Amino acid sequence: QESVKEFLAKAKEEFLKKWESPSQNTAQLDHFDRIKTLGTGSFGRVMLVKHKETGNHYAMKILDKQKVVKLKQIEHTLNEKRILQAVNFPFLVKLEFSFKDNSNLYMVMEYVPGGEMFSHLRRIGRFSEPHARFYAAQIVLTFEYLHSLDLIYRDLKPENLLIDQQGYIQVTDFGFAKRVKGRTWTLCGTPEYLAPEIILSKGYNKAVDWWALGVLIYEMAAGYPPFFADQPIQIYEKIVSGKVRFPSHFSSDLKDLLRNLLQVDLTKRFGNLKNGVNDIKNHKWFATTDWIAIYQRKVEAPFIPKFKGPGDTSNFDDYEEEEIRVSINEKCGKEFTEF
Ligand SMILES: CN(CCc1ccccc1)C[C@@H]1OC[C@H](N)[C@H]1O
């Protein structure tokens, strides 16, 4: 299909040009006013900030250099910055600035005020199948783009999918994304979403993203994920077992798609066969989807989040507000030379 082939051909050209020549050091901390902490966790902190000269709002991610305990954490944060400054796609949050100082690394991204898909899912209870299909189509197109660049995403989960002013998805957190020619081996990802070959410490590939899409569609349509338990070891036992139970309200087409995405044998899993992403796009559950219309954002969304303005934080939750301290002396300079 030639218009698709040439689209992805140009996508890859434009990615490689930025990949081979990353930008660095494009602002500093005292160019911004701090407003509110939007989240804190294994990813560091994300704060709402306002640019003093333009008045524009941004989401600033702050990483503390000295909390590194493993060399793979350094590699992961360098992956994230280099990939984000090189990609361009309608459903990916855009990186606007990056920089570092004596104590921290900073990635300054567009601010999306509608909140996390996770909050809206837990408030509504479950999404109808048309609503879940609207969000799933956007992830299918995003993985078609990323995989064609030889990138694997490895952190799909509802907390990472923000809802924008038009009710469409923006994917955030490239902390585990990586450029991969064949296989890769790191143990990473949230337990509920891990594919069997990650749990079994095998060399793995882009098929782990299509497994995670199966978990995400099930969770959107049921209201809970297919494999859960109080201990990760119990979660892992269900994931590798080859057994999943579907609610009776699931359509027959939905069950059939999920059995093919949640296929424990990676050589039989949809997205990883000879026809690649088209086994998914041509499946009966997507028969009503206009793929070009979704890409061009011409489809009316299932709902628009309620918010008052580009600086409204009411769709995020409350965290203890802590200092952003920047030591008199530099820490960990060499290890982060490339940032
Ligand atoms: C990339 N790492 C941070 C590495 C690091 C950097 C500096 C210091 C300590 C550690 C975070 C993970 O990315 C995806 C996942 N949602 C999040 O846990």
Is 91 within any annotated ligand binding site?
no
Question: Residue 318: which CATH number?
Answer: 3.30.200.20
Spacing of C-alpha 93 from chain mean position = 9
Closest atom of ligand 1 to CA, residue 105: 7
| 120 lies in the same domain as 222 | yes
Rounded to whole angstroms, the Cα distance separating 244 from 259 reads 8
Helices of type H across the chain: 2-19, 71-84, 117-124, 129-148, 196-199, 207-222, 232-241, 252-261, 278-281, 291-295
H or E, element range at 46:
strand 44-51
| 279 lies in the same domain as 154 | yes
Do 24 and 339 form a contact (C-beta atoms < 8 A)? yes
Resolution in A: 1.8
| 122 lies in the same domain as 103 | no
| 268 lies in the same domain as 329 | no
| 132 lies in the same domain as 177 | yes
Pocket of ligand 1 (CB under 6 A): 42-43, 63, 67-68, 73, 76-77, 155, 173, 175-176
Rounded to whole angstroms, the Cα distance separating 235 from 250 reads 23
- Quote the number of domains for the chain: 2
Backbone angles phi, psi at 161, to 5 degrees: -110, 105
Please tell me whether residue 274 adopts helix, strand or coil conformation: coil
To the query of whether residue 155 is one of the catalytic residues in this protein, the response is yes
Rounded to whole angstroms, the Cα distance separating 207 from 147 reads 10
Ligand 1 center to 80 CA (angstroms): 9
Catalytic residue among 155, 173, 209, 279: 155
Do 282 and 137 form a contact (C-beta atoms < 8 A)? no
Q: CA distances (Å), 74 to each of 65, 146, 195, in order?
A: 9, 22, 24
Backbone angles phi, psi at 152, to 5 degrees: -115, 140
Work out whether strand 32-41 and strand 44-51 pair parallel, antiparallel, or are unpaired.
antiparallel
- Farthest CA pair distance, the chain: 62
Question: Residue 298: which CATH number?
Answer: 1.10.510.10
Closest atom of ligand 1 to CA, residue 175: 13
Within 10 A of 207 (CB to CB), how many other CB atoms are there? Answer: 23
| 129 lies in the same domain as 107 | no
Is 61 within any annotated ligand binding site?
yes
| 160 lies in the same domain as 241 | yes
Strands (E), 52-125: 57-64, 95-100, 104-110
Ligand 1 center to 260 CA (angstroms): 31
Is 116 within any annotated ligand binding site?
yes
Give the helix, strand, coil percentages of the chain, each rounded to 5: 40, 15, 45
| 38 lies in the same domain as 159 | no
Is 46 within any annotated ligand binding site?
yes
Within 10 A of 310 (CB to CB), how many other CB atoms are there? Answer: 13
Which residues on neighbouring strands pair with residue 61, listed in sequence order? 46, 107
Q: Whose CA is nearest to atom 5 of ligand 1?
A: 73
Q: Whose CA is nearest to atom 9 of ligand 1?
A: 68
- Residue numbers of the domain that contains 12: 4-21+116-306
Ligand 1 center to 17 CA (angstroms): 26
Find where tokens 């061009």 sit: 296
Ligand 1 center to 20 CA (angstroms): 23
Experimental method: X-ray
Q: Whose CA is nearest to atom 17 of ligand 1?
A: 43
| 14 lies in the same domain as 148 | yes
| 59 lies in the same domain as 165 | no
Residue 32's nearest CA partner among 92, 101, 94, 83 is 101
| 290 lies in the same domain as 258 | yes
Rounded to whole angstroms, the Cα distance separating 158 from 121 reads 8
| 37 lies in the same domain as 130 | no
Tokens of 53: 């000269």
